Design a protein around this ligand. Sequence first.
Ligand code: NA
Ligand code: NA
Lengths: 99, 276, 10
Amino acid sequence: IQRTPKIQVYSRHPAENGKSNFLNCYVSGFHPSDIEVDLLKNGERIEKVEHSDLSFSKDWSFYLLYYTEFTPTEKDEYACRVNHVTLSQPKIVKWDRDM
Amino acid sequence: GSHSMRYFYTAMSRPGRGEPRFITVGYVDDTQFVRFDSDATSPRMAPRAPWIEQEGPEYWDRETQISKTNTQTYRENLRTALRYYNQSEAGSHIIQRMYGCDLGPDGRLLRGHNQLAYDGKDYIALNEDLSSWTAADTAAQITQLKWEAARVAEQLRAYLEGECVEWLRRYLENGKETLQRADPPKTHVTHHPISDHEATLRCWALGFYPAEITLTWQRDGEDQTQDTELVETRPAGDRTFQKWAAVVVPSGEEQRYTCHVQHEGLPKPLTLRWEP
Amino acid sequence: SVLNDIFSRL
Ligand code: NA
Ligand code: NA
């Protein structure tokens, strides 16, 4: 029995165009622990993204935070791309500053 | 407030890709403070919070030596689990363990914990009496017999009532500026038109610590649980957490809705609404 | 500080 990841993409602080911030991709609720996570800027992989140490919740499912510095603008598009044994293809979730 | 310490162990096999990876992480409440990883270049128990850095080299040597022993123990346990479930050596499997203690507001022990899972399913747990076990299946019954014979529960009881509480109180004092500080949520309601007919009201809680929070919507004073979209509490990356709750409301009916917030950083529960 | 388990074999 395996558990597919939940995915939220969001900023550390409320987004203001032109002001430096942090872009977060939080993957959680998944089992087993192997997981592949990319942060994207206009469709391209952002290099040197860092991530928290693997840990797990009371229901034994794993979670990770992937994050990188970014400066939001009106037009640049950001997303997180996730792959896991439970997913046929990588799942891409777009960043929306209102969520 | 109340406080807890937890240690989390994970052992993950990976046949064809070396020996199983073993990790240990220690937490006080929602603050990670130590980590061990067998895949690190030089595996050590290492500090992850500033207030643990003052422990001396004997502290780090002991935590490291135990974690290296545990790496081997849990690799053996993964081999045992294959035998217990009639599984082959080709697949990847995971053992997880949590243990630790919960303190009340007065610093006295509320309860202790020691539980294990195999492949994400509960395997065995120490009961709240810290004296007896609950096994999830016939495999865990075999372990239960071994642990009854070896008086494992008695050892865990002595740790959980003694050393666990004593070290947690020490950490709480050394980290009293942060571990013993609750940050209340910063709250606000945003409004997002969907159509001419409806809009989303989203109630935000930002910047709070610890993670435990309650966030709900009412319409005319009636809970809207089944009609509320409630995301999982999520880390901001600065130690704090975020959450939001959203309802879809008919245009012009926004003042019938109230958002309700409870957090231990708040003196009293908060009520807020959309403020145009 | 971690527990030094006397017996923790499955
Ligand atoms: Na996949
Ligand atoms: Na499995």
